[PDB]
Amino acid sequence: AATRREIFKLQFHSMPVSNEVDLDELILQTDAYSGAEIVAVCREAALLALEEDIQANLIMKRHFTQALSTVTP
Amino acid sequence: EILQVITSKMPISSHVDLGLLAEMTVGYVGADLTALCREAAMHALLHSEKNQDNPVIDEIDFLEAFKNIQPSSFRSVIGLMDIKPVDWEEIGGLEDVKLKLKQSIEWPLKFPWEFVRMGLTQPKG
Numbered sequence: 001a002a003t004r005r006e007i008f009k010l011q012f013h014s015m016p017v018s019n020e021v022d023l024d025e026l027i028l029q030t031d032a033y034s035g036a037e038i039v040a041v042c043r044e045a046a047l048l049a050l051e052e053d054i055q056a057n058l059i060m061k062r063h064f065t066q067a068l069s070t071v072t073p
Numbered sequence: 074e075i076l077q078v079i080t081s082k083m084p085i086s087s088h089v090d091l092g093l094l095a096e097m098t099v100g101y102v103g104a105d106l107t108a109l110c111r112e113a114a115m116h117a118l119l120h121s122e123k124n125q126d127n128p129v130i131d132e133i134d135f136l137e138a139f140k141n142i143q144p145s146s147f148r149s150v151i152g153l154m155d156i157k158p159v160d161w162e163e164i165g166g167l168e169d170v171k172l173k174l175k176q177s178i179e180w181p182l183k184f185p186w187e188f189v190r191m192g193l194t195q196p197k198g
Contacts, residue, residue, distance in 0.1 A: 015191055015192040046193055047193065051176075
């Protein structure tokens with residue numbers, strides 16, 4: 001759990017994430033993913049937030065919840 | 074517009090196509106288009122009438138002079154830009170492969186500031 005906090009904290013330095021998306025339920029909904037598939041969730045949620053309204057500002061929970069369903073194991 | 078410069082000096086009548094004369098002449102260069110318009114002047118002076126007041130050159134002897142002019146080589150090579158416009162709707166099906174090709178080559182060449190601000194890498198081939 002605490003190692004997975006540090007992988008999201010390093011990957012949130014490069015992309016705009018909203019102040020409504022909370023890290024505690026993102027830590028809870030991973031539930032033993034690998035360290036490379038946790039990078040692929042943050043890659044996929046950015047591409048889904050650019051696909052709708054390409055002049056964008058921020059990523060919300062509706063991009064993140066749908067990106068967790070697409071990358072499975 | 075290569076042809077319209079050469080057509081301007083000669084007295085060719087107004088009943089002559091250009092787009093069909095451009096389209097049928099694929100494979101030529103600018104030297105062969107002068108000799109095509111040289112040879113179509115000759116077969117309209119070669120064969121002729123007795124009046125010699127109306128220089129009527131028509132589509133009969135442009136297509137006659139197209140027959141015995143051989144095309145130049147050293148063209149079919151290297152790389153060719155401009156071809157025909159194909160839309161996305163001609164390719165039936167393949168909706169998911171169209172989505173993956175858009176997200177890796179057109180969004181990185183058309184909207185470059187929003188690709189790098191979101192922290193996504195460009196795939197290098």
